Design a protein around this motif. Structure first.
Motif, PDB file in Angstrom:
ATOM      1  N   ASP A   1       0.851  -1.185   0.000  1.00 13.53           N
ATOM      2  CA  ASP A   1       0.000   0.000   0.000  1.00 13.53           C
ATOM      3  C   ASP A   1       0.887   1.236   0.000  1.00 13.53           C
ATOM      4  O   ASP A   1       1.222   1.757   1.057  1.00 13.53           O
ATOM      5  CB  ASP A   1      -0.914  -0.015   1.229  1.00 13.53           C
TER       6      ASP A   1
ATOM      7  N   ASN B   1       0.408   4.274  -0.428  1.00 19.50           N
ATOM      8  CA  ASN B   1      -0.045   5.461   0.288  1.00 19.50           C
ATOM      9  C   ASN B   1       0.404   5.496   1.735  1.00 19.50           C
ATOM     10  O   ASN B   1       0.346   6.586   2.362  1.00 19.50           O
ATOM     11  CB  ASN B   1      -1.561   5.606   0.226  1.00 19.50           C
ATOM     12  N   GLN B   2       0.861   4.345   2.264  1.00 17.50           N
ATOM     13  CA  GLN B   2       1.431   4.241   3.612  1.00 17.50           C
ATOM     14  C   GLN B   2       2.935   4.608   3.641  1.00 17.50           C
ATOM     15  O   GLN B   2       3.788   3.914   3.036  1.00 17.50           O
ATOM     16  CB  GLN B   2       1.217   2.822   4.181  1.00 17.50           C
TER      17      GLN B   2
ATOM     18  N   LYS C   1      -0.680   8.297   6.376  1.00 18.64           N
ATOM     19  CA  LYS C   1      -1.333   8.217   5.066  1.00 18.64           C
ATOM     20  C   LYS C   1      -2.458   9.196   4.877  1.00 18.64           C
ATOM     21  O   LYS C   1      -3.086   9.619   5.851  1.00 18.64           O
ATOM     22  CB  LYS C   1      -1.837   6.818   4.745  1.00 18.64           C
TER      23      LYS C   1
ATOM     24  N   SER D   1     -13.448  -0.223   2.080  1.00 18.89           N
ATOM     25  CA  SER D   1     -12.704  -0.952   1.086  1.00 18.89           C
ATOM     26  C   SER D   1     -13.292  -2.335   0.976  1.00 18.89           C
ATOM     27  O   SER D   1     -13.877  -2.884   1.917  1.00 18.89           O
ATOM     28  CB  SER D   1     -11.271  -1.086   1.551  1.00 18.89           C
TER      29      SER D   1
ATOM     30  N   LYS E   1      -8.654  -6.148   6.691  1.00 14.96           N
ATOM     31  CA  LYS E   1      -7.461  -5.652   7.375  1.00 14.96           C
ATOM     32  C   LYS E   1      -7.049  -6.566   8.515  1.00 14.96           C
ATOM     33  O   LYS E   1      -7.867  -7.304   9.094  1.00 14.96           O
ATOM     34  CB  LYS E   1      -7.668  -4.213   7.870  1.00 14.96           C
TER      35      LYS E   1
ATOM     36  N   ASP F   1      -3.414  -2.957   8.524  1.00 16.08           N
ATOM     37  CA  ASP F   1      -2.772  -3.208   7.214  1.00 16.08           C
ATOM     38  C   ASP F   1      -3.600  -4.229   6.449  1.00 16.08           C
ATOM     39  O   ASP F   1      -4.436  -4.922   7.012  1.00 16.08           O
ATOM     40  CB  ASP F   1      -1.362  -3.709   7.433  1.00 16.08           C
ATOM     41  N   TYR F   2      -3.357  -4.357   5.163  1.00 19.42           N
ATOM     42  CA  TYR F   2      -4.147  -5.316   4.405  1.00 19.42           C
ATOM     43  C   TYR F   2      -3.901  -6.731   4.949  1.00 19.42           C
ATOM     44  O   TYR F   2      -2.765  -7.145   5.187  1.00 19.42           O
ATOM     45  CB  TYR F   2      -3.737  -5.338   2.944  1.00 19.42           C
TER      46      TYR F   2
END
Length: 423
Positions: A38, A40-41, A198, A222, A226, A231-232
């Motif tokens: 990710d 954007n992080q 982010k 989304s 998570k 986090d994903y």
């Protein structure tokens, strides 16, 4: 409607850029880290070269007695580990010039907003979170920050869309902020400190509660599940399990095979540094690994509604979480089976975000014809809390007390937590 974001910093087409109409210039330092999954992080270390500078267009530099404005961003702050972090306020987002403007700073257990006018009058709003708490919503977890400023009344700080602190700012006069915003740890004595940040935004109004709730929702909404830290969630990645109904228990197994069972036991026990933190141990119990079954996506991200298998790690070998749904009673007890020997037993799991504490997952077990066996939770038989799949859960009101038993979080080892696994 109206464009109110005057800075919208996002990773897009291989670069962190301002997506607002102002296209403010971004200067990234040499020691800034980006999450590979990710982008954007953004990770900023306690190093001079770990910084991002945004050069504001003159028209949006804040120089006013009356203009309302807000900022929002997500942050992930590692646990404070050492007494050198007590009484050490350090700036992280700086828009001060000649002692006037605004800044975001951190301290032990704190997120701080400071405004200061051109004659040294100051106000602060503060979010305080404890490190003496069994399970924290905040320590080392992504959290949504929103700060709003109404020049006729209050500044407000919101966390995860909820108002936390409001203080009056009406006595402040002209506030003339910097032409730049500096994202950098400034004045931090802990040499190993870092933050993740982010989705930094600035807005030219005081956001209302609905706007803030929508931003929270939209930037968290989304189709991606998570982990505990925010986090994903990923396939093929070992996780320790947290049941939100029984947060002081952990998952273990009483023998593998169809006559054994998975269960919750406790207490967790504690991790501590005196005067600094005292929390529940998170790295306990059998690890679960999520395995691809139905997903056609070639990445290893777990999406909402993915149909998966769950593997349980026992003595560094993977077993399959499964049940014989033919057993008497609505609650079907789960076992850890040899993968080759699962046969036609029920093992397929639909992963669901609960759609609500952040990061909650539900797991709906289905038979080989796709029929629901029920969400995975637990049931007392009658002194052992065995894990079960039960359609009782599926029949209950969403996000109610009764669905806590079937809400789970997945905890991977993370350096911002600092616990050493027992093994």
């Amino acid at each position: 409607h109206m464009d109110t974001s005057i800075l919208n910093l996002r990773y897009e087409s291989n670069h962190l850029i301002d997506l607002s109409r102002y296209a403010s210039k971004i200067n990234i330092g040499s020691k800034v880290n980006f999450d590979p999954i990710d982008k954007n992080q953004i990770q900023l270390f306690n190093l001079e070269s770990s910084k991002i500078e945004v050069i504001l267009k003159n028209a949006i530099v804040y120089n006013s007695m009356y203009e309302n404005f807000s900022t929002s961003f997500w942050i992930r702050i590692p646990k404070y580990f050492n007494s050198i972090s007590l009484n050490n306020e350090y700036t992280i987002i700086n828009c001060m010039e000649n002692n006037s403007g605004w800044k975001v700073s951190l301290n032990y257990g704190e997120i701080i907003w400071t405004l200061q006018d051109t004659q040294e009058i100051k106000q602060r709003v503060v979010f305080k979170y404890s490190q003496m708490i069994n399970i924290s919503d905040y320590i080392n977890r992504w959290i949504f920050v929103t700060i709003t400023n109404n020049r006729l009344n209050n500044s407000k700080i919101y966390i995860n869309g909820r108002l936390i602190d409001q203080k009056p700012i009406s006595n402040l006069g002209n506030i003339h902020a910097s032409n730049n915003i500096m994202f950098k740890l400034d004045g931090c004595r802990d040499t190993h400190r870092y933050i993740w940040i982010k989705y930094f935004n600035l807005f030219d109004k005081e956001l209302n509660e609905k706007e803030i709730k929508d931003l929270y929702d939209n930037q968290s909404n989304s189709g991606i599940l998570k982990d505990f830290w925010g986090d994903y969630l990923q396939y093929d990645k070992p996780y320790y399990m947290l049941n939100l109904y029984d947060p002081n228990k952990y998952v273990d197994v009483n023998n593998v095979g169809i006559r054994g069972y998975m269960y919750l036991k406790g207490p967790r026990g504690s991790v501590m540094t005196t005067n600094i933190y005292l929390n529940s141990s998170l790295y306990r119990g059998t690890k679960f690994i999520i395995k691809k079954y139905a997903s056609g996506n070639k990445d290893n991200i777990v999406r909402n509604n993915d149909r998966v298998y769950i593997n349980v790690v026992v003595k560094n070998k993977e077993y399959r979480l499964a049940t014989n749904a033919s057993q008497a009673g609505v609650e079907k007890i789960l076992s850890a089976l040899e993968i080759p020997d699962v046969g036609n037993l029920s093992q397929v799991v639909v992963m669901k975000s609960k759609n609500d504490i952040t990061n909650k997952c539900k797991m709906n077990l289905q038979d080989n014809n796709g029929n629901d066996i029920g969400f995975i939770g637990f049931h007392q038989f009658n002194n052992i809390a065995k894990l079960v799949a039960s359609n009782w859960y599926n029949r209950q009101i969403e996000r109610s007390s009764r669905t806590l038993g079937c809400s789970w979080e997945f905890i991977p080892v993370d350096d911002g937590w600092g616990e050493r696994p027992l093994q």
